[PDB]
Amino acid sequence: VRILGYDPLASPALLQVQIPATPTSLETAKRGRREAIDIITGKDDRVLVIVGPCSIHDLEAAQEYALRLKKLSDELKGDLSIIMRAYLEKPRTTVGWKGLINDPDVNNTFNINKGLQSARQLFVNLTNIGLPIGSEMLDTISPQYLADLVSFGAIGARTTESQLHRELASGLSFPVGFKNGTDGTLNVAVDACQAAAHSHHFMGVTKHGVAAITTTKGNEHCFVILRGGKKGTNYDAKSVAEAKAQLPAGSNGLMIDYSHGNSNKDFRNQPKVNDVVCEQIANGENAITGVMIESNINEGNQGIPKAGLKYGVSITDACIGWETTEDVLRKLAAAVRQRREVNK
Amino acid sequence: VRILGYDPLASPALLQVQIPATPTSLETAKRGRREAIDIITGKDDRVLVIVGPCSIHDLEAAQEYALRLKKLSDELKGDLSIIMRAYLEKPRTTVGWKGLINDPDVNNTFNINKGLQSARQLFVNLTNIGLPIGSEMLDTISPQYLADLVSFGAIGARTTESQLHRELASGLSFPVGFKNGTDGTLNVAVDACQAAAHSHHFMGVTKHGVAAITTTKGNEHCFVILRGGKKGTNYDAKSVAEAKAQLPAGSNGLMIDYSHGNSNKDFRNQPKVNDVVCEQIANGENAITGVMIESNINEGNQGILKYGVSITDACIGWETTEDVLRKLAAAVRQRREVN
Numbered sequence: 001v002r003i004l005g006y007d008p009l010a011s012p013a014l015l016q017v018q019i020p021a022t023p024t025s026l027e028t029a030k031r032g033r034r035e036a037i038d039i040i041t042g043k044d045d046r047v048l049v050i051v052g053p054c055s056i057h058d059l060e061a062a063q064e065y066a067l068r069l070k071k072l073s074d075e076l077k078g079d080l081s082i083i084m085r086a087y088l089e090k091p092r093t094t095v096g097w098k099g100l101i102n103d104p105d106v107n108n109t110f111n112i113n114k115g116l117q118s119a120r121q122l123f124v125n126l127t128n129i130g131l132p133i134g135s136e137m138l139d140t141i142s143p144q145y146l147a148d149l150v151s152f153g154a155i156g157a158r159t160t161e162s163q164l165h166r167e168l169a170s171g172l173s174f175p176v177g178f179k180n181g182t183d184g185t186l187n188v189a190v191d192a193c194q195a196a197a198h199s200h201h202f203m204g205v206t207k208h209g210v211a212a213i214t215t216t217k218g219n220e221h222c223f224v225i226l227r228g229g230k231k232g233t234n235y236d237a238k239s240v241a242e243a244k245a246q247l248p249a250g251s252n253g254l255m256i257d258y259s260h261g262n263s264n265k266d267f268r269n270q271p272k273v274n275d276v277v278c279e280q281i282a283n284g285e286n287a288i289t290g291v292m293i294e295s296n297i298n299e300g301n302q303g304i305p306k307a308g309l310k311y312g313v314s315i316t317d318a319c320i321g322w323e324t325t326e327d328v329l330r331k332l333a334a335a336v337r338q339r340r341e342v343n344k
Numbered sequence: 345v346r347i348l349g350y351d352p353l354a355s356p357a358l359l360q361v362q363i364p365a366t367p368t369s370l371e372t373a374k375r376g377r378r379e380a381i382d383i384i385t386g387k388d389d390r391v392l393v394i395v396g397p398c399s400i401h402d403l404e405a406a407q408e409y410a411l412r413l414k415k416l417s418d419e420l421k422g423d424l425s426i427i428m429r430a431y432l433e434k435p436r437t438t439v440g441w442k443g444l445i446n447d448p449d450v451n452n453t454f455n456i457n458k459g460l461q462s463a464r465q466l467f468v469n470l471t472n473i474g475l476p477i478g479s480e481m482l483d484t485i486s487p488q489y490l491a492d493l494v495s496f497g498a499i500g501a502r503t504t505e506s507q508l509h510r511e512l513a514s515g516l517s518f519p520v521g522f523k524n525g526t527d528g529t530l531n532v533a534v535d536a537c538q539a540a541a542h543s544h545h546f547m548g549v550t551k552h553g554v555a556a557i558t559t560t561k562g563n564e565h566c567f568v569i570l571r572g573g574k575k576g577t578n579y580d581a582k583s584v585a586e587a588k589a590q591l592p593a594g595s596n597g598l599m600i601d602y603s604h605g606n607s608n609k610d611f612r613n614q615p616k617v618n619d620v621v622c623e624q625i626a627n628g629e630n631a632i633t634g635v636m637i638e639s640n641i642n643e644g645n646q647g648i649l650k651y652g653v654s655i656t657d658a659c660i661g662w663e664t665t666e667d668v669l670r671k672l673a674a675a676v677r678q679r680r681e682v683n
């Protein structure tokens with residue numbers, strides 16, 4: 001009585017034939033995974049940076065952003081391994097635009113087949129210039145359409161406790177970051193990393209678009225992302241110490257989100273978080289192996305009236321602009337270099 | 345590289361033909377929905393009770409429990425509308441047995457086809473004696489297999505914030521209770537009820553076992569369940585007053601879980617919670633429309649087997665359950681007098 005209807009959906013395999021990855025896309029996605037693994041598992045003393053828009057709504061603006069980020073990445077590659085945020089799926093507090101896949105026209109038409117086409121085309125476009133990408137793995141079905149192109153997955157604060165998302169992460173072929181809970185505590189993310197490291201058996205959709213029983217291997221490349229919350233921000237040295245004390249043997253390095261709960265309702269705080277994180281890194285904190293930054297061409301955000309949208313400005317959370325981003329990243333690279341001196 | 349394999353899965357439509365609902369089963373499911381709706385929406389002054397095991401691992405023990413509960417339901421039907429907890433899916437803190445569907449043999453062999461068969465057979469067995477059932481809607485695919493038999497769905501504390509579960513709830517044909525978060529606060533459950541009331545568009549598995557785009561209508565029959573948590577228990581008058589203050593216009597009545605966070609790691613506290621809830625109801629609290637109780641044939645729990653004892657959270661036993669529900673029925677009668 002509460003299903004209005006079902007509409008046909010192209011299978012993952014069909015979409016993959018229709019929008020093939022280039023060899024460059026595939027190598028880029030592989031390289032991103034390898035570099036991320038090496039950092040979170042302590043093989044490499046560079047910092048892993050997941051940086052880019054809160055959400056993608058415009059392929060052309062995403063491409064411009066990507067070209068700037070790739071240029072900066074080439075310059076800072078001795079110190080930072082950069083993966084672009086290319087987030088397709090947005091968890092809402094209640095309701096709102098859910099992202100490019102769910103409603104690519106941003107006008108409540110919900111053309112999900114077009115959204116999947118736009119998402120896969122975007123992912124090919126970005127990786128094809130040699131820039132690895134990451135996204136929040138919110139939907140448990142959409143990864144089948146896109147995972148060959150992805151180097152990093154986030155499980156959001158609102159889904160870190162969800163057994164379905166822990167199951168999902170246990171079968172993804174790339175590193176996964178679990179955000180702490182929206183209440184600001186990290187136990188649920190530590191628990192999620194534990195759970196996702198195990199094999200799981202569950203029903204899921206295959207590349208052929210049919211439901212089957214999935215058996216996963218477990219994902220040893222899960223790590224905690226500190227993103228603040230109701231209890232307060234958690235990017236500081238005492239919070240980091242508290243996090244380290246909770247991590248089991250075998251744990252990977254920590255990532256600090258400069259945005260969301262750690263920015264206290266304000267994009268202008270992201271450079272302030274960067275300063276505190278840089279201080280810790282430069283003074284020899286080796287457990288901070290990653291950061292996350294919400295960054296766009298231009299700063300701030302805007303409401304949704306698509307033809308009436310301002311260019312290069314977020315339609316979800318407010319972001320720092322490009323110029324601020326470059327400053328933040330250069331400062332972070334300097335801190336990485338200083339950490340090496342302390343470690344020598 | 346992290347998918348070891350895929351194994352074939354019977355479709356929902358196939359399972360529904362293989363294990364058909366009886367006419368009694370379908371009428372029972374429909375009745376349970378109607379009665380739950382009337383209570384949570386304030387049409388009926390009875391209290392809705394979701395009562396039964398933490399989890400089902402044993403179909404025979406579940407049937408014996410059900411026959412007892414059905415007899416008690418008949419006794420107390422002027423005051424209580426009873427739906428049995430027939431929970432098939434268990435959200436774990438980290439890892440552990442996930443329930444009857446995931447691993448019916450309880451031996452890490454994960455025969456999900458057998459689990460779905462056992463689950464649907466169980467659900468037909470229970471509803472066929474005239475006892476409506478409810479379950480936690482953890483898996484987003486399994487409801488296709490079972491929803492025709494279900495009168496109530498819970499979204500657990502660990503998934504109330506999940507947009508996938510809000511989407512699911514928005515398309516379920518029965519009332520849905522969203523537990524408060526594990527931190528003990530209600531905001532996320534209020535938000536979830538708002539979200540689930542809207543129409544959603546999302547990818548989902550159909551009765552034919554294939555993925556398609558689903559459009560839902562929205563579910564106006566979602567309500568909050570108070571189940572305690574880190575910030576403390578939330579079954580007392582202050583907690584209920586605070587809850588009522590955050591409920592928007594158009595909200596449904598509250599349900600109080602006696603167990604989980606509200607029992608403070610101890611099944612023996614469920615009757616104590618009952619006393620505090622009864623006091624409120626009896627003195628005129630009309631916003632409490634539901635309770636949830638973890639109950640089995642025998643009390644306690646056991647590690648992973650003794651008949652009628654839970655292999656997950658500890659439950660009150662049958663005799664205690666009779667006492668608790670008779671006292672609750674008395675409180676409902678007393679509230680009628682106040683009103």
Ligand SMILES: O=P(O)(O)OC[C@@H](O)CO
Nearest residue numbers: 090091092093094096317
């Ligand atoms: O739904 P909102 O507006 O609270 O936004 C949630 C975002 O921060 C994450 O998608």
Ligand SMILES: O=P(O)(O)OC[C@@H](O)CO
Nearest residue numbers: 434435436437438440657
């Ligand atoms: O995983 P556990 O042992 O903490 O048990 C969780 C239960 O209370 C809910 O399934």
Ligand SMILES: [Co+2]
Nearest residue numbers: 054294316317
């Ligand atoms: Co954001």
Ligand SMILES: [Co+2]
Nearest residue numbers: 398638656657
């Ligand atoms: Co329980």
